[model samples]
Target: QQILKKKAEEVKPYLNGRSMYLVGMMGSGKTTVGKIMARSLGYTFFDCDTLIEQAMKGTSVAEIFEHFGESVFREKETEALKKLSLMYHQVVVSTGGGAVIRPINWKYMHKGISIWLDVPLEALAHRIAATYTAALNRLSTIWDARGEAYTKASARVSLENITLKLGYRSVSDLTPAEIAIEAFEQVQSYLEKE
Candidate 1:
């Protein structure tokens, strides 16, 4: 706790009141880690999808997908991002998995630092299997497509490979807090280099 507090203080000034955007695939811990980081930095935490749902009067994301289609949901996502970009600073934003596919979304995201949560496809598959119960090939296809876009939009990418690097049994062994710390460290490094 004390160490995390110190690290957050160390990175706070470098943030310069800008927002921090977490971009990644579904089940990549954006919401989980983002909330922690926001709390650490005394910033507001906004989940783009949640904001969109709220704007739609509490309609759930799955229902939005069912009713409006992915393209329409994406448009709403971009609109929500634009609104968030204009409204706040020192916010931690957890974006939808597909948010980076739109150039306009990147324009809005560039208003802050975009941090990509680079969790492996296998790990993502494991995490989202319940919700995304498509065949393995279909899941891989979607993952590959979005993976490329995420790599392009990220200002900093934190790969969820610490377990592998540290000789753990599985890549999925990493915890959300561990990933968040790596994200903050990488963001701080990026800021320092700028």
Candidate 2:
């Protein structure tokens, strides 16, 4: 049987114009979800990493990382978050994977409703290898270091939950619109609570 087709517009009425910040691993597909969610809610979509790239005069994120090292890259990330946070509302920012490690970035990230996209570890590895790694060595390492930090986000969108609930075999098999739907449900749940 086909189930609910609840629209994100239902959540918009409950929203007070707070922005949404998506935090996840590099290959977690937050960008696609953010765009879908934004489209549904009539919010502006942003990828902080892309903001940095554009600000850097078209230099890519990998190029920035390779050219200036992690410290410099992180500083730029913070700057991107800072500018985004100052924007106030009607925004959905999908942040860099490493953005959670820095406390200062959280200050900006916290300005919005932060949603952590929790993808399965193997799914993450697979996605990174195919569509998106030292990446795995660095991927698991990045996870080990920032896993706890990621939990501190305002909410969580567990891919496992979505996969099983929707009868999907794998997170990779799920679409961005499905993820976006769940994200709004999570936000709406919070909107009606403390």
Candidate 3:
């Protein structure tokens, strides 16, 4: 039964022009790879965080969190996610790490395809360890609180999976372009099989 399900997924139709929603942790390259994927595919790319900032009239996300707290930030994140969800065909969206913390966000994501860029905790820990301590600390808190929701993502692919398809030996060996292209192909395959 598991093998059959896997085979079916392998042959699922390409999502074609439907939006692709990238969901995962902070260092998982949602924004970077999503932008590349969208451009390569000749589609628009929307960064959920940017949209939230736009809606907040020039306020930065860090500032928003500072002033209004996480609850408010999450509310705006939800609203921005929903608005982006309704956009017409052929888009790539880089979601906030905690975007799926709300069930409503998952419902909207189900309207298209959801791809979870699964970086190993060690990889995530390493990446975050080297850069952005404050952001990493906050993400650690969020992850500790919302680990299940994050893991419940519709589809998952490891950083190594993104690299292996490109003949790279390790996740760290894959370039941004390679990661985007590989992920896009995987997403295309996923849609076809499903």
Candidate 4:
């Protein structure tokens, strides 16, 4: 508990006056890291997708995607993001990979620190192919499209750096909790310089 507490402190610098928004490709560990990071820092944790589901009365993102198409889903995503931005404080926010494509969504992140998890496309492909249904078809296209938005992040760190700085061995080396502990540390470093 004491050691975990120290790890959370590392992220304190980057957390100044804002939420720490973790933006990345799916499967890059944002949600996993956000939850643990929030816990370590004594902040709130919010998964935008989950929040959307709750707002829509238990509908899955996949279901929403199917029923209303990506545009509708985008609206929901945007709405949820806006709400979170207004309501939460000192939070670790894990957003969907595509969330940054919308300029409006970036507005909501304005009061927060945004960090891009710069995982290699190959790394993204491998991890995404193994874990999710959404990435099965459009991995290449989505990667090509969103590359620029991702680069706009205030700070970019490789997944390797995330694991190493946090003292983990591999992407698989760190449990979500462990990863969050490290992520908070990285964000803390960013805040100090910014």
Candidate 5:
């Protein structure tokens, strides 16, 4: 535990005021893991989706998508990333699932360390299926479209099985603290390599 604490401190200087952006499909633990990492690193945590909703004056993300369509929602997403990218170091950002579809978003995300939570398609589908039918139907299409884009935009990619590897049956089966430790280790490794 002391070693982990020291490692986190060591990485802080290297960050140099840049945020860490977690990108991946929904149910991949971006929000869960990001919050934990933020606290562990003593950084502010922001969910880009939540920020977009707040910017919409209390409008929900689903409401925004339903009323104004995906393009408008995506535009707002890019704007949110642009805003966050300019913030000082000590920020951990969890991006929306489709944020990588826009090149402009990547331009901003690149300002920090973009980590892709590369959950397998089967795992993603199973997780989504347990939630809602619409998401299940949309999963394949979304994965097919953004999988490669996410790979290209990420500075580091985590292809670990959150379930099998982490001894959890599902995303809900895992805690943020545990995920945070896993993420911290991965980030620490990536930083060490640099």
Candidate 6:
């Protein structure tokens, strides 16, 4: 863990205040990993979902989606993304999964290093329990829709590959910290290029 701390310390100056955006499905560990990365990098963290709540007078993500519908929620989500984009640096934001679906949202996300936390849908499905009849199908189709959008990330931390390399039976068997190291390494190389 000291190695991670040291590397983060070294990487901080290089970042020079570029934001880090975490984008993926709901159960994909974006918030978890973003918080971990933010702490290590000595940066502030914001879950865009949390910002959405504040924007809507403390409504929950599920409540917003179910009660207000996507139009209201997406608008607020987009607004929050835009606000965070102006933060410049020192902020790690775990954005809404559909944030990438909007062209303007991508422009805001481009203000930072967007990282995609990719977990196998099967594994992710196990982590979540929603009120859908075709649960896995719902998850799969969401992936189908967002698959290309997530590719727009500056880096991808693939837990499916990580599980295979670590001899795990499923991607769900992995933890956020394990994936975070891979994220850090990928970000490290990207920083090298810049």
- The parts of candidate 3 lying over 4 Å away from their true place are 1-13, 131-141, 162-169
Could you give candidate 3's per-residue lDDT for residues 20-120 as a string of tens digits?
A: 88998878888888887676666798888887777787668789778889999988888887887785677889898789789989988888888888776
List TM-scores for all candidates, in order: 0.89, 0.89, 0.79, 0.81, 0.82, 0.89
Tens digit of per-residue lDDT, candidate 2, span 13-39: 777788999999878998998888887
Superposition error at 26 for model 5 (Å): 1.0
lDDT assessment of candidate 1? 0.81
- Candidate 5: regions farther than 4 A off: 1-7, 58-60, 131-137, 153-175
**What would the per-residue lDDT of candidate 4 be over residues 6-97, giving only the tens digit for each residue?**
87666565456478788998778888767766787788888888888777866677887788899999999899889888988888888999
Considering every candidate listed, which one attains the maximal lDDT? 2
Clashes of each: 0, 0, 8, 2, 1, 1
> At residue 134, what lDDT does model 2 achieve?
52
Q: What residue runs in model 6 are displaced by over 4 Å at the alpha carbon?
A: 58-68, 129-133
Please report the TM-score between candidate 6 and the true structure: 0.89
Q: What is the lDDT of candidate 5?
A: 0.76
lDDT of 3: 0.74
lDDT of 1 by residue, 71-146 (tens): 8898899889998899889899999888988889889888789898887776677766744446355668878777
Name the candidate, 1 or 5, with the larger lDDT value: 1
Worst 10 residues of 2 by lDDT: 1-10
Give candidate 3's TM-score.
0.79
